[PDB]
Amino acid sequence: NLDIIGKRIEKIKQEHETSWHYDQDHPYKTWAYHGSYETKQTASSMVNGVVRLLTKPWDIIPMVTQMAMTFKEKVDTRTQEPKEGTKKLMKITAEWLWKELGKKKTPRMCTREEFTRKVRSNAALGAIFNKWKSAREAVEDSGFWELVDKERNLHLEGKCETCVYNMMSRAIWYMWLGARFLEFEALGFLNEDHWFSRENSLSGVEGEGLHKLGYILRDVSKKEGGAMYADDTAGWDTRITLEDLKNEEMVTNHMEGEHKKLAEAIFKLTYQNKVVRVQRPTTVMDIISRRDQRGSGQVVTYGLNTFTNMEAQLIRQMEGEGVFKSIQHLTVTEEIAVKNWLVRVGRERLSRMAISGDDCVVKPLDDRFASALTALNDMGKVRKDIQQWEPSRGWNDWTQVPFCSHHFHELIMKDGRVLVVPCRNQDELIGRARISQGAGWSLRETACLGKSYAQMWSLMYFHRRDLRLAANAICSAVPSHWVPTSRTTATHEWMTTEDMLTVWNRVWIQENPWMEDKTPVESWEEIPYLGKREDQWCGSLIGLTSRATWAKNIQTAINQVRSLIGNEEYTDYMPSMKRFRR
Numbered sequence: 339n340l341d342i343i344g345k346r347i348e349k350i351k352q353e354h355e356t357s358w359h360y361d362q363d364h365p366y367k368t369w370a371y372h373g374s375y376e377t378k379q380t381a382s383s384m385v386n387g388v389v390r391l392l393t394k395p396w397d398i399i400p401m402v403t404q405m406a407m408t409f410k411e412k413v414d415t416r417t418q419e420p421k422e423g424t425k426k427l428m429k430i431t432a433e434w435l436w437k438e439l440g441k442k443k444t445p446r447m448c449t450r451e452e453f454t455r456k457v458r459s460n461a462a463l464g465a466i467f468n469k470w471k472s473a474r475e476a477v478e479d480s481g482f483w484e485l486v487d488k489e490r491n492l493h494l495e496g497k498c499e500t501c502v503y504n505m506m507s508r509a510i511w512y513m514w515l516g517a518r519f520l521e522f523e524a525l526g527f528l529n530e531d532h533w534f535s536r537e538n539s540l541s542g543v544e545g546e547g548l549h550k551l552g553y554i555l556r557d558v559s560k561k562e563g564g565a566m567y568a569d570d571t572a573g574w575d576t577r578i579t580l581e582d583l584k585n586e587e588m589v590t591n592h593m594e595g596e597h598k599k600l601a602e603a604i605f606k607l608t609y610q611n612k613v614v615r616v617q618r619p620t621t622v623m624d625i626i627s628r629r630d631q632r633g634s635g636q637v638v639t640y641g642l643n644t645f646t647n648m649e650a651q652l653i654r655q656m657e658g659e660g661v662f663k664s665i666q667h668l669t670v671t672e673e674i675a676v677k678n679w680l681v682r683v684g685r686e687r688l689s690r691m692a693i694s695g696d697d698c699v700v701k702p703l704d705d706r707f708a709s710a711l712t713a714l715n716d717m718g719k720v721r722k723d724i725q726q727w728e729p730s731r732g733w734n735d736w737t738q739v740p741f742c743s744h745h746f747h748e749l750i751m752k753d754g755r756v757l758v759v760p761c762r763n764q765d766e767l768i769g770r771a772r773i774s775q776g777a778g779w780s781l782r783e784t785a786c787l788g789k790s791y792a793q794m795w796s797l798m799y800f801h802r803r804d805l806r807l808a809a810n811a812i813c814s815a816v817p818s819h820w821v822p823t824s825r826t827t828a829t830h831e832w833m834t835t836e837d838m839l840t841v842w843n844r845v846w847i848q849e850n851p852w853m854e855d856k857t858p859v860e861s862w863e864e865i866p867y868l869g870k871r872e873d874q875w876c877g878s879l880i881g882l883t884s885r886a887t888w889a890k891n892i893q894t895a896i897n898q899v900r901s902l903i904g905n906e907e908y909t910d911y912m913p914s915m916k917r918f919r920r
């Protein structure tokens with residue numbers, strides 16, 4: 339307790355001595371409270387005018403238009419201690435999983451140089467603004483690195499002064515760039531060296547890309563066994579227990595030297611003990627603490643979420659297969675049974691899953707899995723939108739399974755070759771491309787963000803009639819040599835000035851390990867669409883008067899945007915489509 343967090347709290351007391359008061363009207367039940375102090379400030383969603391002017395029919399569709407307008411009583415909840423049998427299952431499974439993930443990888447520190455390069459190429463590291471303006475400036479100043487040095491030596495000494503979270507079904511915990519560096523140095527290897535790639539982790543999909551996820555689900559579907567289960571957890575980050583954080587920390591058992599001590603300090607001082615500052619309109623700043631829940635950088639959060647989800651789903655599979663009888667207590671001979679199951683079939687059982695952080699798909703050995711709920715509920719991983727003891731409903735068809743906000747279609751090219759393509763309701767795709775975040779967007783920056791969405795649509799969603807047409811219109815409306823841009827950055831093959839047909843051939847044909855025939859496609863007309871009725875099912879406006887007038891008159895829309903941007907060099911991409919080809 340206060341011997342680990344006191345110094346951080348002490349240091350905050352003194353910067354705001356003209357305001358410190360142990361307020362009595364504090365709304366916290368499950369967070370430990372320490373004091374308040376004075377502040378006064380808050381970034382809404384802004385519309386992308388280039389995308390909106392080229393998607394006119396969607397101006398009257400409320401599912402699109404409402405997306406641009408506008409639970410912290412789940413952060414202030416508590417999870418119960420799991421039983422002794424559950425704690426043993428989790429410790430055995432976690433020990434085994436770190437060894438498997440570690441067989442072909444070597445833990446190592448990430449460098450000032452790798453961090454400095456990350457900040458100089460826009461990664462959403464979740465930092466705060468203020469002794470330097472941006473991240474870019476702090477990194478190019480030896481004063482910053484001396485602050486980092488001070489904290490680093492405090493961490494080696496087993497102590498923390500400045501590693502404090504700032505809070506803001508979401509809750510993002512920003513830290514100062516220095517605390518983020520020390521997290522990246524100790525634990526960045528999990529992401530930088532691809533510990534959760536499918537090759538290394540068997541269940542993971544880190545680095546795979548949206549063009550591979552449907553092929554991966556089809557490969558899981560080919561296994562003998564029961565239905566495909568895709569249960570969502572209610573508020574995963576709030577259900578991470580102190581027992582979960584202690585099993586995650588066992589990665590440090592595979593480290594040595596400085597790295598070992600630096601990583602044990604991140605886990606002990608910042609993950610298993612946290613200090614947070616939160617805005618309350620009653621506008622003041624509260625300083626609260628707690629031992630559990632997930633509060634890390636979003637990239638470390640992703641890898642540890644994937645680890646703990648892999649662990650939880652293997653235990654759920656053991657429960658369905660009858661490996662242990664009760665969570666109350668694991669007997670001596672059940673321990674050996676569990677260890678033996680892991681050694682004998684653990685790798686096969688991992689290959690039956692696709693896991694992306696808190697998101698999973700599992701094809702278990704049979705449907706006993708559906709009603710195997712005691713360990714899952716006792717670990718605190720309570721399913722969303724189902725009663726606690728109601729058996730899971732599974733999917734009989736891999737093309738209907740939800741994963742990473744998508745479903746997947748099997749699409750047959752006129753030449754017989756098979757594409758497995760990503761899809762989601764088209765209102766969600768158009769509504770997201772019409773939105774930007776942040777201030778000071780030039781017209782050029784806005785256009786280049788529109789081009790990023792358009793090239794993503796050409797590569798991932800070419801099979802949706804409306805998106806292939808809107809993508810061609812946006813690419814025709816933005817100067818041809820202008821480079822697609824994003825403020826926040828799966829693999830991003832659409833972020834390029836290369837010809838999109840060349841990129842499509844590389845991704846879907848040349849580098850696609852599920853495509854045996856490597857014959858290149860010569861034109862967009864060779865690339866198929868969903869059936870017309872399936873396109874409509876997934877939100878297409880084909881067959882509406884609004885959509886027909888938009889498609890017929892698209893050159894007028896393209897010319898409106900060109901007139902706003904001005905006299906630049908443009909390409910007409912519309913004749914790549916049969917209907918505009920004369």
Ligand SMILES: O=S(=O)(c1ccc(F)cc1)N1CCNCC1
Binds near residue numbers: 782783784786
């Ligand atoms: O509007 S931009 O995309 C742009 C790109 C290249 C230029 F030479 C000029 C402008 N944008 C500028 C501000 N932030 C980075 C990206």
Ligand SMILES: O=S(=O)(c1ccc(F)cc1)N1CCNCC1
Binds near residue numbers: 870871874880881
């Ligand atoms: O066959 S349909 O699904 C269809 C959908 C989109 C089209 F552009 C053309 C046909 N249709 C048949 C008539 N009743 C409505 C549904």
Ligand SMILES: [Zn+2]
Binds near residue numbers: 489497499500607
């Ligand atoms: Zn610290």
Ligand SMILES: [Zn+2]
Binds near residue numbers: 745747761762876
């Ligand atoms: Zn679909």
